[PDB]
């Protein structure tokens, strides 16, 4: 989460690897975020 | 013999909707053009007959998709008018606000895409960024991006989320600066101007017979407006002024769209200043559903909920024609109601369906390379024309 | 019983106009079947044309006849030009309609009250 320097690109993520004991890195896409981080990452709510 | 028969093309990179076209021409000059419309025709008016008023409303959203809250306002005003209801004041004000916001949308689109079609790859980008801010507003308001209704008969529902009008204000603050940036991007450009100057002019009475209603009549003489003459809601009160032009030249129509964007900024401003905190929906439980707190715990609210969804409110019989000012010009729906839940026969009026019928005369005097600009100049969506 | 007849007062001029129309079709069958590059022999196409005329042969009222003639000159007015692709002109022919059994115990044998 950025210092708030700017909107729209507020916050950002790295998905890393091994999720569900399946795939690998380089496969990054959506749905890698769990539900609550989906909420707070989309500007839905300002509270992590 | 000579002449030719040429045809359309499937898309420009920004293309909204596809027409065919058959132009019998002379050497690089079009003597006769005969647009084939009806290519994309989804048969809404037959569908609406099978679905109740509350159900058929998204059709009135997406028949003309670009300008949306306006069409919403048209159908809603129709059902209210025929149904003898008035929305509470705050509903009317919100409806005006998003009405002129939507007008800002459809105008900025029409202008920019009119550039991208002709050349000028960039202004499309600069301004549709701001348009993305606009949909950033809708997503808060109605809970979805574009087609989300947020308009009913008997007033809008689900009032603004707390803290929205701040964002509205903030966009409206510097939008003036940015649209002026477009005005330096164009308007004294020798290229764009010298491409569209005298192309596709119109005589005022001729426009009346051909039934053009919109920036057409605006930019060509014949001073007229529905907003001023037949105020359909509190949109009467706020002060502003419409532009005109004396050259009927298709350049006037452009500049008139611009100045209507600016005036739209005025109306948005004054609206933000005048907003009463009354309520959202009307208070009549049988026209519009109760909020859940009253729904639960109270019997009659529950019943009117359940039936008002299953069967839907019944509208007394009558024939109405309502007309509003939509960014493509005069838009309207003619409702025909058997005393019932469902409607019966409702034909929308597409300004594009009129304006498009004018290419025959308008394009008679200029070769096809500017028939491009002739089509694109009058705001038109082939999703709205067909229906 | 009053009426506002269209192009003809009596079935006479009706028969006249439909004769005209069939002349037009029998003119332009080869030009089209060659024009859209159909696989049908001109003879076959013409036979389907006269068939489509024969289907309606039992009509009497010359209002109806005249209106059907308007339909005909309208569709022919679309085929004389290119406005209709290979698709529809083929769509008069039915290749992809499965043959429908018209004999009883075959119908009964399958369709269960068609």
């Amino acid at each position: 989460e950025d210092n708030k320097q700017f909107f729209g690109r507020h916050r950002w993520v790295i998905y890393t690897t091994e999720m569900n004991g399946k795939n690998t890195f380089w496969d990054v896409d959506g749905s890698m975020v769990p539900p609550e981080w989906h909420r707070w990452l989309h500007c839905m709510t300002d509270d992590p | 013999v000579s002449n030719l028969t040429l045809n359309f093309g499937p898309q420009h990179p920004a293309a909204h909707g596809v027409l065919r076209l058959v132009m019998e021409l002379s050497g690089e000059m079009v003597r006769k053009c005969d647009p084939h419309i009806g290519l994309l025709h989804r048969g809404t008016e037959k569908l609406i007959e099978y679905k109740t008023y509350l159900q058929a409303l998204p059709y009135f959203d997406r028949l003309d998709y670009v300008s949306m809250m306006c069409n919403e306002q048209a159908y809603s005003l129709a059902v209210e008018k025929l149904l003898n209801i008035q929305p509470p004041p705050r509903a009317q004000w919100i409806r005006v606000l998003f009405g002129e916001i939507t007008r800002l949308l459809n105008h900025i689109m029409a202008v920019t895409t009119h550039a991208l079609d002709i050349g000028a790859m960039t202004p499309f980008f600069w301004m549709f960024e701001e348009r993305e801010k606009m949909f950033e507003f809708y997503e808060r308001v109605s809970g979805a991006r574009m087609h989300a209704a947020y308009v009913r008969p008997g007033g809008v529902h689900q009032d603004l989320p707390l803290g929205l009008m701040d964002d509205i204000y903030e966009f409206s603050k510097n939008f003036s600066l940015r649209i002026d940036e477009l005005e330096e991007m164009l308007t004294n450009n020798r290229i764009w101007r010298n491409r569209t100057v005298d192309i596709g002019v119109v005589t005022a009475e001729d426009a009346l017979n051909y039934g053009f209603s919109g920036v057409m009549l605006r930019g060509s003489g014949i001073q007229w407006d529905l907003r001023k003459t037949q105020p359909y809601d509190v949109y009467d009160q706020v002060e502003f002024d419409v532009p005109i032009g004396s050259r009927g030249d298709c350049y006037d129509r452009y500049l008139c769209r611009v100045e209507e964007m600016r005036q739209s900024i005025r109306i948005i401003s004054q609206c933000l200043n005048k907003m009463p905190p009354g309520e959202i929906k009307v208070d009549d439980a049988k026209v519009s559903p109760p909020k859940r707190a009253e729904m639960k715990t109270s019997m009659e609210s529950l019943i009117h909920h359940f039936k008002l969804y299953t069967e839907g409110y019944q509208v007394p019989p009558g024939a109405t024609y309502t007309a509003i000012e939509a960014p493509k010009g005069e838009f309207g729906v003619y409702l025909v109601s058997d005393g019932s839940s469902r409607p019966y026969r409702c034909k929308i009026k597409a300004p594009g369906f009129a304006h498009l019928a004018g290419l025959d005369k308008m394009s008679k005097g200029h070769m096809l390379a500017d028939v491009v600009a002739i089509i694109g100049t009058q705001d038109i969506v082939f999703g709205e024309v067909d229906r | 019983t009053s009426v506002k007849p269209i192009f003809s007062r009596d079935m006479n001029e009706a028969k006249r106009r439909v004769r005209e129309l069939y002349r037009a079709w029998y003119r332009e069958v080869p030009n089209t079947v060659h024009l859209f590059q159909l696989d049908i022999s001109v003879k076959q196409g013409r036979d389907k044309v006269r068939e489509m005329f024969k289907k309606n042969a039992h009509v009497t009222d010359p209002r109806v006849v005249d209106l059907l003639v308007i339909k005909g000159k309208m569709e022919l007015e679309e085929t004389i030009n290119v406005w209709k692709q290979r698709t529809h002109v083929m769509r008069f022919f039915h290749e992809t309609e499965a043959p429908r059994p018209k004999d009883f115990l075959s119908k009964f044998y399958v369709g269960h009250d068609p």
């Binding site: - | - | 019983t1 309606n56 009222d61 068609p114």
Partner: protein, 123 residues
């Protein structure tokens, strides 16, 4: 104008496919749904069609058909208009006769009457 007076039955071939021969059309006045009491559903003649088969779709099982005319209904004011539209529009029809409640005499006092067998127990 030269109105050209003409006498023949009106028929239409400018309308859809061979369904006209096979299907019979039904005319009636729908009888009140009994589980409610009220007549406003009644008073208007209707036209619906002989129904046709429906099956369980192997992917889901929604009902499905080729019966384009299945879901139509046409409200008429008087039966003469039903037979008129059936004749004119070309496909065969069958009429059902309209029925009404039979006029009755209910006297509340007859609940309590002296020698008459009618008496309301519990009221």
């Amino acid at each position: 104008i030269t109105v050209d007076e003409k006498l023949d039955i009106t028929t239409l071939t400018g309308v859809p496919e061979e369904h006209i021969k096979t299907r019979k059309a039904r005319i009636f006045v729908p009888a009140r749904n009994n589980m409610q009491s009220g007549v406003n559903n009644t008073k208007k003649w209707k036209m619906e069609f002989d129904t046709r088969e429906r099956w369980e779709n192997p992917l889901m099982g929604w009902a499905s058909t080729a019966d384009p005319l299945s879901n139509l209904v046409l409200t008429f004011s008087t039966k003469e208009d039903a037979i008129a539209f059936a004749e004119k529009n070309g496909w065969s029809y069958d009429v059902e006769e309209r029925k009404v409640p039979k006029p009755k005499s209910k006297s509340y006092g007859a609940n309590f009457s002296w020698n008459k067998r009618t008496r309301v127990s519990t009221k």
